[PDB]
Design a protein around this nucleic acid. Structure first.
Ligand SMILES: [Zn+2]
Lengths: 282, 694, 349, 48
RNA sequence: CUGUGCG
């Protein structure tokens, strides 16, 4: 029953983090057994918050921690502060267009495209084109650079409706004088070239995201009273039990799923006698 | 196979098939036909029905000498009262007369018998193990002289490695002058080192690797610097170009990989050599060839010196096994009663302490037992430690087992932790016993320990044979077995002197004594002398048959026996089956009575035993014999020399370099016997090439 | 003693070498693979990368026994070498480039990389993986120890290691650079880092790959209980008593004949044709499906192929030969407790 | 998708005799299908 | 064919 396994993975990830902080990379996700998300060939339903990131794990990204906030749509509602540069003959047209794309959430990115056209010089009228190629570069996540490659073809630049302001301007910059569908990436990769990277690792400690030591948000999960107790059993050692039961009630303060009824189930919980832990939080 | 290189390897089988078809179609004797038809097949157990089984007028005499008393149909109750009568007779003719074969233990008298047989009272040896055995004397002296008391050396060892690697290429086709060249390099680098840094010959060399005018060379050979200058004096004037010829030869047709930038071409200045020689006075070794005990009373020794004694023993064993590994094809520069002076002997080094180092000097190389001399060097002063004579092959175990034996000691002693005070007098005794066993490897010691195991088996139990004590005594030689035997019997007595019956903590005592007896496995089992070993093997092989009197002289080797041979053949067969069931004289001679065989066979046939003949799954579904153990056989040597000589004749289609010997190394694959055989076959092939040359 | 004996020959002590020091009563229910794994684990004081590789091997075993659908592609991936195969295992299990350039930092020198140590010893006069030799031996049907060791030392100082070319050992051990970057110092002369072997890199293989291979071997050998972490516990020298092995096998323990032959024919026909079964007339019984595709023999056959120091298949088709072990309560008191919770982590059903 | 050189490896593995004769005399690129061109498909092993 | 070390 996909929902039950979903909440079971949720509780497994919550309680595994309950002992020590960890990063949400493939090292700490794919190393857990539960992992029925690549199962369920009809994968219409998912858990909740992580529904974003695992949507890429079905294609196995080599990422550490992307800033997934598609709830604030980054593909749409994008600033169009775009421009262009001159050319450098090798007819050969070489251009380098740099943009400062942002997102709906708190984010920023700079994306530059290097484009080369091999064309034929015209006699008088316009031009004669043969072949065109482009290459992307610069910062941008799996959604940010997709945004960039989508907007680079949706711009009043050369491609579109003319908008070729020649005016003997770019020739004057090139010749010194003062007289008168490349969408095959769809990934996190910076398109074979980009700036420095590998910083800002997110760590997860108490069900709350910590980008560098700051709390971002915490989600919800139930514990019934049977899954929690049966998951309390051994692991390998005892101070893990100490930490997890010391931190469970603080997480319970953010949840209202008080469904652990009082019966001998409480005693089978109590088997691991830790009274002052469960009375400390209060 | 009948294959060859002249046919298309598909016609010979057809020819054979047609030939056999023709021969089976018609003929024209008896065996010739079958042999010829059997020799043309390809592949073909029991059921040899085609055999003739012909007689030669001798099978009968075998038959009535073997199959006259055999019936195998005797009924059962007759066997019953025959056995009843036999037992009744046996009871009152041989058992009441005291002619039995087994008896009760009577433990005490067994203890006095053991003490009499083991503990020697008529011997003149002293009760002091260290000074009865030479090796233990030497190791005691070393350990009690040791307990109570910088890039020059590494550069020296590196150049030793360089020269010792380059010597193995034998690129000069000569040996004596090659060693002369190496020692010339050695003295040149001596005088190069000693030109400056005056605190190197007296400080980093005396405490490093040198003794009185005795400097190590290549091939673990130590040579006297005096004779070094004396030999360098020659080859000058007679052929002053010699060193020059040694200089251009290391560049062309040479590996040309050397660090001898200047230490080689320099002329040796003899004044520096003689100054170095006169710097050090002569303390030349003696190597004593061919009475008061003050030996520290090992029984009153601390619990520290014994492990260091074992460690020194291990170091000496490693030095001995390193001396094993010295080169065989080595000849000294100058050849050599009761005191022989050493000037060009071989030496090995072993390490004890930060300043003092031990040296083991020996004169011959090879594989077998030799004589060695142990010396020490504390701070450049060379002292006398001793000399001995032994076979290094029997010292492989203690090479590094200086810790496992100790652990064995404390664990075996702690086996007896039930009584406080029994460990104190048994621990050191056991350790001394182990030390003596390791330092004196011989067959006699392990045979004596086996006799102890049998003695323990008889004592701890109740009934034993009457001929037990006679199989426990072994004659003693060299006065080294007496001490180990005394230690063993003393341990046995001390553990079993008093009330030691099977009504107390006796199982662990039995275990401890059994392990003491099994300590015999420490000695390696590899026949100290082999020739005497075939002597004894043949001796005990042929003694019983000569005693019986049926060992005939060389037969025809083809199936014909002379009249005397067959006569004594039948005589031996009759004597084998000429034993009665009443006479007690024949109780140790080989033979058996046909009557009791009839009894047993008849009783077994009629399903009376626990098993019967109701079997299932019916059963009917190039070395030379004259020399065993030799590495090579005469047939093999002849085959190899013939192959080599044929190959060399074929290649001569003159001139032949030493590469012919390479062929010897190609078809052969070395120990001393291996290299002697290789030298012999090299000799043979060389004079073979010589005779074909004429 | 044996470690000193082999070191004296100039070979140099290695992470496997001889039998490990500081062992425990757990010679029972443990083969050569288990003690070698124990030695490797004891090499590292604080087990973090070994624990990570054990989790990787646990995941691989979980998905190779019944999980997902897998196997017979590891046959492809392992045959290349040590580095690429281990990496590929990592992203099949889940890793990062940081793992790739972090785990592969621990390297050890393997002199028998381009083959075997050439040598001639004091043998009797006149006279390819070892697994093939073991199969050949199984299908078919005066020298002194002192002189044997003497010949060993003799042959061990000559041009023995092979490259490309024959050369000595000492230049191999002197080509290493003593960088001492706090990662090649916790176990001297055993493990080195990547930049410490830039001068000579042909004889350089990772050790975590070997540890992973042995972990998978133990998974095929004696169960999945070797995946947990060792925990330590919290007698008159005379209390002897008997122990039975407590091994659980998930490889169809019976393991009759003619099962390895079909697997090696299927996966490596070239190795099956030459160097294998010329002398056989009953090929047909193993030819027409003599129980092909065993529970785990298909995957645990290539690890004995690639690594020449396992000796597992030749170990597999033999009796324990002991079936009982005498021990004292004194040694049982301090024996390490290594029992694993379920790899499902037992919440599954 | 069911690319080429997948049935050939299966028929070689299961029936080497049928693979040897009556099959692939006229082929020079055996190696691509020989060194694990995706052996042991999802169901082609049984439905062959 | 072709050994240099137990500090
Ligand atoms: Zn004395």
């Amino acid at each position: 029953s996909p929902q039950q396994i979903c909440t079971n993975f949720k509780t497994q990830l919550v309680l595994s983090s309950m002992v020590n902080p960890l990063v949400l990379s493939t090292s700490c996700l794919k190393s857990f057994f539960w992992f029925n998300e690549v199962l369920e060939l009809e994968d219409d339903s998912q858990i909740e918050l992580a529904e974003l990131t695992d949507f890429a794990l079905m294609v196995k990204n080599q990422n550490v921690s992307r800033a997934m906030f598609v709830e604030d749509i980054a593909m749409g509602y994008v600033v169009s502060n775009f421009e262009g540069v001159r050319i450098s003959l090798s007819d050969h047209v070489r251009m380098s267009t740099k943009f400062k794309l942002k997102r709906k959430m708190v984010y920023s990115f700079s994306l530059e495209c290097i484009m080369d056209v091999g064309e034929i010089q015209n006699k008088e009228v316009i031009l004669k084109v043969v072949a065109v190629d482009q290459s992307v570069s610069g910062s941008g996540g799996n959604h940010m650079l997709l945004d960039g490659v989508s907007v680079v073809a949706s711009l009043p630049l050369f491609t579109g409706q003319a908008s070729f302001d020649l005016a003997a301007m770019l020739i004057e910059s090139n010749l010194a004088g003062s007289n008168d569908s490349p969408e095959l990436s769809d990934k996190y990769s910076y398109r074979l070239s980009g700036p420095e990277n590998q910083e800002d690792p997110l760590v997860l400690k108490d069900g709350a995201f910590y980008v560098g030591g700051e709390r971002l948000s915490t989600y919800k999960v139930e514990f019934t009273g049977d899954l929690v107790v049966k998951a309390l059993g051994a692991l390998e050692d005892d101070e893990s039990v100490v930490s997890m039961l010391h931190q469970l009630w603080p997480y319970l303060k953010a949840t209202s799923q008080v469904i652990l009824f009082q019966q001998e189930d409480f005693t089978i919980v109590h088997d691991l006698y830790k009274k002052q832990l469960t009375k400390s939080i209060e | 196979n009948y294959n060859n290189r002249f046919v298309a390897d598909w016609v010979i089988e057809r020819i054979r098939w047609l030939l056999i078809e023709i021969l089976k179609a018609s003929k024209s004797e008896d065996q010739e036909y079958q042999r010829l038809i059997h020799s043309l097949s390809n592949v073909k157990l029991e059921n040899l029905e085609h055999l003739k089984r012909n007689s030669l007028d001798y099978d009968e005499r075998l038959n009535e000498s073997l199959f006259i008393g055999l019936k195998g149909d005797i009924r059962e109750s007759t066997v019953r009262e025959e056995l009843i009568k036999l037992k009744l007779w046996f009871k009152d003719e041989v058992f009441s007369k005291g002619l039995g074969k087994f008896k009760l233990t009577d433990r005490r008298e067994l203890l006095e018998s053991l003490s009499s047989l083991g503990a020697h009272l008529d011997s003149d040896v002293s009760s002091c193990p260290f000074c009865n055995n030479k090796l233990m004397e030497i190791v005691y002296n070393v350990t009690f002289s040791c307990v109570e008391r910088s890039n020059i050396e590494k550069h020296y060892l590196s150049v030793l490695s360089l020269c010792n690697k380059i010597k193995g290429l034998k690129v000069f086709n000569t040996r004596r002058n090659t060693l002369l060249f190496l020692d010339l390099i050695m003295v040149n680098l001596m005088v190069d080192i000693s030109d400056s840094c005056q605190d190197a010959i007296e400080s980093l060399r005396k405490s490093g690797l040198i003794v009185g005018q005795m400097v190590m060379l290549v091939n673990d050979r130590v040579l006297d610097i005096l004779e070094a200058v004396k030999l360098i004096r020659k080859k000058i004037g007679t052929n002053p170009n010699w060193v020059k010829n040694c200089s251009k030869i290391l560049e062309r047709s040479h590996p040309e990989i050397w660090h001898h930038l200047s230490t080689l071409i320099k002329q040796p200045d003899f004044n520096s050599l003689i100054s170095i020689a006169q710097h050090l006075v002569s303390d030349r070794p003696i190597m004593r060839y061919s009475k008061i005990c003050r030996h520290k009373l090992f029984q009153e020794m601390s619990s520290f010196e014994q492990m260091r004694l074992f460690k020194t023993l291990s170091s000496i064993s490693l030095s001995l096994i390193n001396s094993m590994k010295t080169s065989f094809s080595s000849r000294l520069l100058v050849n050599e009663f009761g005191n022989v002076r050493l000037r060009e002997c071989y030496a090995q080094r072993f390490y004890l302490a930060e300043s003092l180092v031990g040296f083991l000097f020996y004169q011959k190389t090879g594989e077998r037992s030799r004589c060695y001399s142990v010396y020490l060097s504390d701070n450049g002063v060379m002292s006398e430690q001793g000399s001995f004579y032994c076979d290094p092959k029997r010292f492989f175990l203690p090479v590094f087992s200086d810790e496992v034996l100790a652990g064995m000691c404390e664990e075996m002693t702690s086996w007896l932790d039930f009584d406080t005070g029994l460990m104190n007098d048994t621990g050191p005794i056991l350790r001394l016993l182990v030390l003596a066993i390791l330092c004196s490897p011989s067959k006699r010691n392990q045979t004596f320990l086996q006799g102890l195991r049998y003695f323990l088996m008889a004592f701890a139990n109740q009934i034993h044979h009457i001929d037990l004590t006679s199989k426990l005594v072994v004659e003693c030689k060299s006065s080294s077995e007496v001490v180990v035997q005394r230690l063993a019997v003393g341990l046995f007595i001390r553990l079993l002197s008093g009330e030691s019956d099977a009504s107390l903590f006796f199982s662990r005592r039995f275990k401890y004594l059994l392990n003491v007896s099994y300590l015999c496995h420490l000695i390696t089992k590899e026949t100290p002398d082999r020739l005497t070993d075939q002597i004894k093997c043949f001796e005990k092989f042929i003694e019983p048959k000569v005693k019986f009197g049926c060992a005939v002289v060389n037969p025809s080797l083809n199936g014909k026996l002379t009249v005397d041979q067959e006569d004594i053949m039948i005589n031996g067969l009759k004597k084998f089956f000429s034993k009665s069931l009443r006479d007690t004289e024949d109780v140790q001679t080989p033979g058996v009575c046909k009557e009791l065989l009839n009894y047993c066979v008849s009783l077994f046939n009629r399903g009376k035993l626990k098993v019967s003949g109701e079997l299932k799954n019916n059963p009917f579904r190039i070395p030379k014999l004259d020399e065993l153990g030799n590495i090579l056989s005469t047939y093999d040597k002849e085959k190899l020399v013939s192959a080599c000589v044929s190959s060399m004749a074929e290649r001569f289609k003159n001139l032949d370099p030493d590469s012919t010997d390479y062929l010897i190394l190609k078809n052969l694959t070395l120990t001393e016997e291996q290299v002697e055989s290789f030298n012999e076959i090299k000799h043979d092939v060389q004079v073979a090439l010589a005779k074909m040359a004429d | 003693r044996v470690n000193q004996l082999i070191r004296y020959s100039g070979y140099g002590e290695t992470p496997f070498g001889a039998i490990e020091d500081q062992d425990v009563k757990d010679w029972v229910d443990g083969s050569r693979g288990y003690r070698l794994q124990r030695k490797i684990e004891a090499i590292f004081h604080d087990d973090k990368e070994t624990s990570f590789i054990r989790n990787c091997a646990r995941k691989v075993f979980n998905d190779i026994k019944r999980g997902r659908i897998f196997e017979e592609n590891l046959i492809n991936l392992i045959g290349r070498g040590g580095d690429e195969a281990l990496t590929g295992f990592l992203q099949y299990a889940g890793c990062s480039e940081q793992e790739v350039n972090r785990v592969l930092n621990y390297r050890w020198v393997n002199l028998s990389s381009f083959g075997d140590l050439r040598l001639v010893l004091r043998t009797k006069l006149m006279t390819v993986p070892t697994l093939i030799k073991t199969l050949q031996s199984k299908l078919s049907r005066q020298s002194s120890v002192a002189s044997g060791f003497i010949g060993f030392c003799k042959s061990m100082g000559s041009k023995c290691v092979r490259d490309g070319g024959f050369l000595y050992i000492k230049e191999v051990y002197s080509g290493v650079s003593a960088c001492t970057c706090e990662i090649c110092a916790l176990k001297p002369k055993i493990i080195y880092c990547n930049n410490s072997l830039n001068k000579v890199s042909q004889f350089s293989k990772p050790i975590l790959w070997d540890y992973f291979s042995l972990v998978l071997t133990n998974a095929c050998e004696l169960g999945e209980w070797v995946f947990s972490t060792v925990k330590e516990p919290q007698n008159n020298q005379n209390f002897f008593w008997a122990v039975k092995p407590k091994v659980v096998r998930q490889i169809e323990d019976q393991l009759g004949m003619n099962h390895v032959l079909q697997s090696i024919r299927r996966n490596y026909p070239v190795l099956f044709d030459e160097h294998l079964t010329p002398f056989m007339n009953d090929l047909q019984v193993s030819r027409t499906m003599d129980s092909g595709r065993l529970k785990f023999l298909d995957v645990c056959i290539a690890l004995d192929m690639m690594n020449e120091n396992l000796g597992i298949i030749s170990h597999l088709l033999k009796t324990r030969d002991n079936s009982v072990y005498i021990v004292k309560q004194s040694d049982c008191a301090l024996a390490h407790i290594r029992q694993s919770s379920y790899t499902d982590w037992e919440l599954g059903l």
